[PDB]
Amino acid sequence: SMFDKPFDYENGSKFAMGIWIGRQMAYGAFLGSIPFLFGLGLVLGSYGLGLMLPERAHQAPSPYT
Amino acid sequence: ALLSFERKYRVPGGTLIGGSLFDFWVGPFYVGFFGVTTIFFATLGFLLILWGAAMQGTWNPQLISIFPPPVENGLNVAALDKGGLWQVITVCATGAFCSWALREVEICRKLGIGFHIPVAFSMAIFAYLVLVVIRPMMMGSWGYAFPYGIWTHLDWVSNTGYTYGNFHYNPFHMLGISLFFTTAWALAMHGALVLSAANPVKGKTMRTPDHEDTYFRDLMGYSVGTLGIHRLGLLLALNAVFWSAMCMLVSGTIYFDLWSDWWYWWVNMPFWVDMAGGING
Amino acid sequence: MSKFYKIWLVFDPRRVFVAQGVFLFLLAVLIHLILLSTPAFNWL
Amino acid sequence: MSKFYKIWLVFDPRRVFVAQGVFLFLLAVLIHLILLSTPAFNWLTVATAKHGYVAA
Amino acid sequence: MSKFYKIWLVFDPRRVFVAQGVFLFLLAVLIHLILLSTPAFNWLTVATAKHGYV
Amino acid sequence: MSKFYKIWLVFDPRRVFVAQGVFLFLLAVLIHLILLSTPAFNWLTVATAKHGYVAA
Amino acid sequence: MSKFYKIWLVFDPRRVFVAQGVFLFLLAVLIHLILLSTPAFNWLTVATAKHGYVA
Amino acid sequence: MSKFYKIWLVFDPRRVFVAQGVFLFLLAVLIHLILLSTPAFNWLTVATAKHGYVAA
Amino acid sequence: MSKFYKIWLVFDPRRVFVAQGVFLFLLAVLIHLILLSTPAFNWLTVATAKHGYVAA
Amino acid sequence: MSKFYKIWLVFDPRRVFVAQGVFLFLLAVLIHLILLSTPAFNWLTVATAKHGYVAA
Amino acid sequence: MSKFYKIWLVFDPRRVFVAQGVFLFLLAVLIHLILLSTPAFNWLTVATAKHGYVAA
Amino acid sequence: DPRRVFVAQGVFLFLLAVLIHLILLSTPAFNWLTVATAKHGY
Amino acid sequence: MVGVNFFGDFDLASLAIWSFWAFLAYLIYYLQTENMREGYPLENDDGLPSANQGPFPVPSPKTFELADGRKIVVPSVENEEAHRRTDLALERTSVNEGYPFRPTGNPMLDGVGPASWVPRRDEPEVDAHGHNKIQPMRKTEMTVSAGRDPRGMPVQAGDTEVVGKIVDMWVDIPEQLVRYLEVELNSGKKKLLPMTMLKIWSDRVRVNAITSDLFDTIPDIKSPDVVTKLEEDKISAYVAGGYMYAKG
Amino acid sequence: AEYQNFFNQVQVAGAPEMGLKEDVDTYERTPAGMLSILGWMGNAQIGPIYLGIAGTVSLVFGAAWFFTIGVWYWYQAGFDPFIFMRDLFFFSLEPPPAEYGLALAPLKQGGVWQIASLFMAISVIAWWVRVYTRADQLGMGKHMAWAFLSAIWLWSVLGFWRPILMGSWSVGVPYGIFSHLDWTNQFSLDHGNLFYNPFHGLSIAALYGSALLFAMHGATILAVTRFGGERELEQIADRGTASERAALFWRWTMGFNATMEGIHRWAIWMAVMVTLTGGIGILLSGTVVDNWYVWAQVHGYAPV
Amino acid sequence: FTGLTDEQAQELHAVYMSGLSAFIAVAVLAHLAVMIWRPWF
Amino acid sequence: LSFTGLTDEQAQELHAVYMSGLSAFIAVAVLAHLAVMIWRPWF
Amino acid sequence: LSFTGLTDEQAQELHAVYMSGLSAFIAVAVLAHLAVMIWRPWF
Amino acid sequence: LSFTGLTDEQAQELHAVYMSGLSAFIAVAVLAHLAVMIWRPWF
Amino acid sequence: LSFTGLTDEQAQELHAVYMSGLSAFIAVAVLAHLAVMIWRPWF
Amino acid sequence: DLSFTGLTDEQAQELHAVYMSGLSAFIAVAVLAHLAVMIWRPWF
Amino acid sequence: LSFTGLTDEQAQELHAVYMSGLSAFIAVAVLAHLAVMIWRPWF
Amino acid sequence: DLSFTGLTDEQAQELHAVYMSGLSAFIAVAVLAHLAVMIWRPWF
Amino acid sequence: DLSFTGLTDEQAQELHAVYMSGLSAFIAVAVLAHLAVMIWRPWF
Amino acid sequence: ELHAVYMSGLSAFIAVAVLAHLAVMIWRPWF
Ligand SMILES: CC[C@H]1c2cc3[nH]c4c(c3C)C(=O)[C@H](C(=O)OC)c4c3nc(cc4[nH]c(cc(n2)[C@@H]1C)c(C(C)=O)c4C)[C@@H](C)[C@@H]3CCC(=O)OC/C=C(\C)CCC[C@H](C)CCC[C@H](C)CCCC(C)C
Ligand SMILES: COC(C)(C)C/C=C/C(C)=C/C=C/C(C)=C/C=C/C(C)=C/C=C/C=C(C)/C=C/C=C(\C)CC/C=C(\C)CCC=C(C)C
Ligand SMILES: COC(C)(C)C/C=C/C(C)=C/C=C/C(C)=C/C=C/C(C)=C/C=C/C=C(C)/C=C/C=C(\C)CC/C=C(\C)CCC=C(C)C
Q1: Which is it for the CA torsion J12, J13, J16, J19, positive or negative?
Q2: In this entry, which stretches build a coiled coil (chain N) (predicted)?
Q3: Is R3 close to H41, i.e. CB distance below 8 A?
Q4: Which CATH superfamily is domain N198-298 in?
Q5: Under a CB-based contact definition with an 8 Å cutoff, are residues M134 and M179 in contact?
Q6: M75 preceded by cis ω (within 30°)?
Q7: Is residue F16 part of a domain?
Q8: Which chain S residues touch G7 with a CB distance below 8 Å?
Q9: Exposure winner among E40, M86, M209, N13, fewest CB in 10 A?
């Protein structure tokens, strides 16, 4: 992949290896942000979209007794 | 344990995350990165449902119910004993559903087939997200989502439906029901037609697809064809779920009164509204 | 204790670090979201 | 207990460690969440009452 | 009695210990949850009453 | 009487032991469930009345 | 009646034993459950009244 | 009466004996259940009255 | 009146006997239920009155 | 009237007999059920008034 | 009025006869049922009024 | 449609005839059974 | 029949619901066995038959008789051996079970993985009347009714290099459907490209599954105007294997 | 994005296929035409259609049922064309009131509903023999007729069998757009929340399963159309790589799979369960159980 | 349109009218009996 | 001439036995109506 | 005819056994109605 | 008359065992009905 | 016949142990019913 | 075809001997369990 | 004999370790039950 | 085949030694965590 | 020697040493973050 | 001629239909 490059273990300094680990972990953290942002975008986007509704949308009767 | 032909297909590659770290099978099941996360989310969601049963005090599976937060709670993260457990299970369910679809993508890539199955399943995920996330947030609270119980989520359907009178009069609901009925009808005919050809009358050779086209042209005067029926069966099921999600998306967000009153725009048109007689006088 | 380096002979480091990033990021999100259920630590 | 190393001649370490890791995280989350569901052992609400922050 | 070792000539050890591991965990969780469901044997509930945790 | 061993000439021991194990466990759960459903034989309910634990 | 052993020349023994075992278990459960449904023959409720188990 | 054996030349004995057994069992359960419906022939109800059982 | 045997030259015996069997059974069940549904000819309630069964 | 046997040169005897068989049965049931509906011709509720069975 | 025989050169005899059978049977049932509905021409109601059978 | 137009047109004649005949029965003025009941004292 | 209980609360609705579970339990058993007519008995990674075969038994053999009188029996050893690949170029990546098999060589050419083809019968698929189901358009009298006619269009490979031109279309006569496009490469050889893995643009045909260098090794058809079920399996599997094995 | 094979890229059409002459009287088939708009998703050929006597009987009695309802609407509209179009969805051909039982009600008070129902019963049954006969003359199995019989079972329970057992035609379904929706809602109300009918739940599981199964199977076949997976009949006789990749997707996803022929046994049985269990649940409603929610509470699965 | 020659269709019409006439006669006899029993005119 | 693969001779045998069965059916029906008319006339 | 593959001799022998069994079924049914007629006549 | 393939001698022993089994079933059924008649008659 | 593939002597061997198991099962069942009849008779 | 599993007569005797040992041990514990419950809370 | 491919010696080595682990698992479970019985008896 | 994994006894021995060191450290931290929670908020 | 991942024992040590250095830095930062929260708003 | 057959038969049907309409009038007229 573009962000999941392999590393040259036999030809590489510790700092280059240390940076490579961080790039790998950052790419993993970026992948983990895909569902978090999508979920956050769903919740806040839907709530934001609901704030521009005819205002009877926020006072519907509860479906639970 | 492999099928007699499975070995030549069990090859490395096709993963999206992790490469060969999780690229293996457990029995028949393929495990990937999303196989690992599906197991985590499915097991956590299942154990939290059992924990919710323990707090509820009942162990009858048909009486277990995890309820969302109260409507007054708004969009806040609720306390675990006060409907916040429902929110955790909702995240576990969505994590399990989404990772299940992504796991199917990895399996699609390994087998070299089209991605129709994960995409078709994403429509089912979308309808679930409409009922638990999109619609409740547009209405302002997590308390409008359905509960996680076998028979209590039917009470939610009943209470949600009767909020707008008879829910049958929702026009998107009519379209969704018609497609759901059409999908079951086409599934019966597709299964029957293939089995009719593959299992002919005794003493007859196995029928060709020419017989299948001939049979439905003789019967109805039309035949979609072997490729057409699988396209159409997929589209009917996806449209049925999509227009169902629309019916709920507009109920309580755009439309608030009884759905039976909506159909009176046709009657109240100002060129036949005043004419006496009929049903509406 | 000093022999834990052999974990990289079992699991490919290139692939584990990506998995660590997914886990560590989502754990930080999970803890922040758990804090919100309590208004006392509800930072926002 | 002197012959327990033979486990690794039956179960490959790669799959056992992956299964063990998921099980431990799953169990830890389950137990932490069970305590959070119990208001008397919810350390966040206990800290709120001890010091006094919102109490709501 | 002393011939029970032959179960491994019939059952694959890898299949069994997966099934046994799932069985023992799901049984152990079930029994703990049954006790937690009953206030009499909910050790967390017993502790709040004992120490006045409120 | 001493000729029942021929059952294994008909049924695969792998298949029988698995089905027997599933049956024996599910049967045991069923009987324990029936006793727990009956308040007279629910040993947890009996204990909480004998020792006066909570009764709530 | 000495010729009844020829049933096994018509029906596979493995399928008969499984089907008979499933039948006998379900029949026994059905009859036990019928007795449990009737309070007169429910041996747990009879023992409750006999021994004063409160319930 | 001397040619009834030719039915097996028309129907498979495997097919007949499976269908007949399902028929006889279903009929027997039907008749037993019909009697259990009628309180005059419910032998458990009759035994309860005769032997003075509780039947709560 | 002896040409009735020609029916088997146009009708499959396997199909006729199955159709006849289902017809004869369903016809008998219908008649028995009809008598059962009429109290005058319901033999269970008739026997109850004659022999004085409780019929609770 | 001596040339009515030509029908079997036009119609399939297999289909005609099946269609006639269901028609004769369905017609007979319909007439019997109408008669049962009418109390004047319900032969079951004629004997109960003649011999005297239930009168209820 | 004697050239009508040409019509059998066009229509299939099977479908004309089946159409005749359905149409005639449907009409016959329809006319009978109208008569049964009208108590003046209900031959069973006339019979029970003439013979004094049940009148119920 | 040499053998097909006849069937359709016959249906139109049959549907209309069965229609109007039953309508006359619905109206008591045009019901012949009703008038026969009155004359003979049925 | 309302409120009529055989015993306890077991009324006629209880009898119906419990009767259904027995019928449903049997129906699932029937459906599961009917789906065990292919791919059984199970095997291990080493090829030997497996110890575990599952709680459902293999159903009794059933015969499909074809129009040519072949009498295929499923499940059967001969049917399974007919569709069994031999001399597969695969090696085990680990001694443990449940691990992938590494191709030893070129997976596209060896037909493994997503490039796997099945030994189908080496005969053209045939319609009811006996004729070949799939035939070139020139062999029949059909015209392009709608859509974009691909005849003469350049064929652009996945690496954006032009590899030839479409010279013919192969249609499914009983279904009135285009199955393959016959491409004439620059070298003069003719290959078949399945329509399901092509995209007909307004001015060209693009094949993203494989690159330009792999077009010369697309499996060939022995008869110029006849395509065979075996050849269709090889051509389809080769092109579909490109998505994983084209360039990396 | 690659080609998703949802619509044909090229349409090719020649002489329309007039069908197979197995035992069909081919002179009873109409001409065959080609409609291009239908050829993008499926076949472009429209026709030929077989018209025997079963189809003709079904068509005339179906038309009579359709027009019997229609003429009743004109009577309800005062024979006003504007009122007819205004209230088309509100018009209803109601069954006779409950005072008439199973008798022949007057024409104005449910007798027309009985006439219309009779025409519908003939038309549906005449169509069932058409479904059976068309398959018989082509040497095919009668699976379509048996699957149709399951739909007829629920339809006959709603209109015929249940009104017979309930003792009156009044419980039958009115012939109207909104009215038969109101009947459906009223059926649930006066039987205590039909949601708690177990066979209604089984019917819904089959109906949801039908859409789940057709989405699974439709997408599975489109995924393997690269290898001719839509030619299912040839895959049954001669298994190809399309059948194996389809089986291996579901084995690696669910742990178990079907075959090309066997997936259509799941398809037919999932679909007929919709109306097989549905017919049973409607028959039990009123005749055996009058309050499903209370019945539920007795049997668990409903709180006390 | 049918596939029947003129000679084969000659008896086809004769038998049909032979059967139709018998059907009419029974209907006529039935109406005469009903008029005697319960006249509607 | 056969529309269903029946010879003319076959149609003779088939119609003869059919009328034999029909004759028996009417005869039992006539006796049954006679008995009902005597038992409980509808005229 | 011969729509079922039976011969003239096969069909005649099959019909003889059918009638013998049918005769037994009628004989029991007649005896059953006589018993019901004695116990509880419906005429 | 070979729809199943029995050799007209296997059927005789097939039917001999079946009737022997049928005889045992009827005898127990009659003994059961006699017991219920004594216990509480339904006539 | 011989659908299962067992020889006649193998059927005797299989039936001999089937009936021994059936005899054992019924022997327990009869003792079970005798015990219940003494403890709580249903007649 | 009375050798469906492929075991020999000798193997079946060896396998059955171990199975009956396990069955006996299972029953013995079950009998002890019922005896304990009968003492603790009899159901007769 | 050896459906799993293990030999008699290997199965003993498997079982010796399994029984070692099982006995340790049971020993802790007995102590845990004893602790709960002392702290909060369920009998 | 008691070497399903393909490891040798020597390789399994040294893998087990490292695994037991990781387990021991994990159990040690959990014991310290439970001691801290028991002192802070006992559950018995 | 075992090397499920194709790293030598030497390469695993070098990678693990770098990984543990980053792990120690990551924990030390996280401890500092907790001390900030513990000072501002303790949870015990 | 096909049409020649139809017109003669159709006219006879109309002829009796007219004769029946006037048969109603002499028995019970509406105009
Ligand atoms: C397994 C259960 C599912 C199912 C299965 C199923 N349905 C089936 C089948 C099967 C297996 C068939 O084989 C059968 C069929 O033929 O399918 C194509 C059918 C069928 N299911 C149908 C409908 C249908 N199925 C439904 C449901 C279901 N079917 C279930 C979900 C529904 C719903 C949900 O309500 C409907 C509406 C039909 C398409 C067909 C049966 C058609 C039939 O019997 O029609 C008879 C003929 C008529 C009623 C004539 C109608 C005429 C028009 C009203 C127009 C008339 C006027 C016009 C101007 C024309 C001219 C008239 C004259 C002047 C000439
Ligand atoms: C609702 O309306 C009511 C009911 C109130 C009033 C309406 C009444 C109506 C519409 C009545 C209509 C009645 C009709 C049309 C009755 C018709 C009855 C007929 C035609 C019955 C015919 C029966 C024929 C039978 C039983 C023939 C039987 C033949 C046999 C038993 C012999 C077997 C046949 C063989 C062997 C043929 C094979 C031979 C060869 C050589 C192949
Ligand atoms: C509703 O009813 C309730 C639930 C309330 C009550 C019902 C309770 C029931 C039905 C309980 C049932 C309980 C049962 C059946 C429990 C069974 C428990 C068993 C059998 C436990 C066995 C455990 C064995 C263990 C933990 C063994 C561990 C082994 C090791 C740690 C060593 C590892 C070595 C291995 C895996 C193989 C060695 C390999 C080589 C090469 C030597």
Answers
A1: negative
A2: none
A3: no
A4: Photosystem II protein D1-like (1.20.85.10)
A5: yes
A6: yes
A7: yes
A8: 11, 15
A9: M86
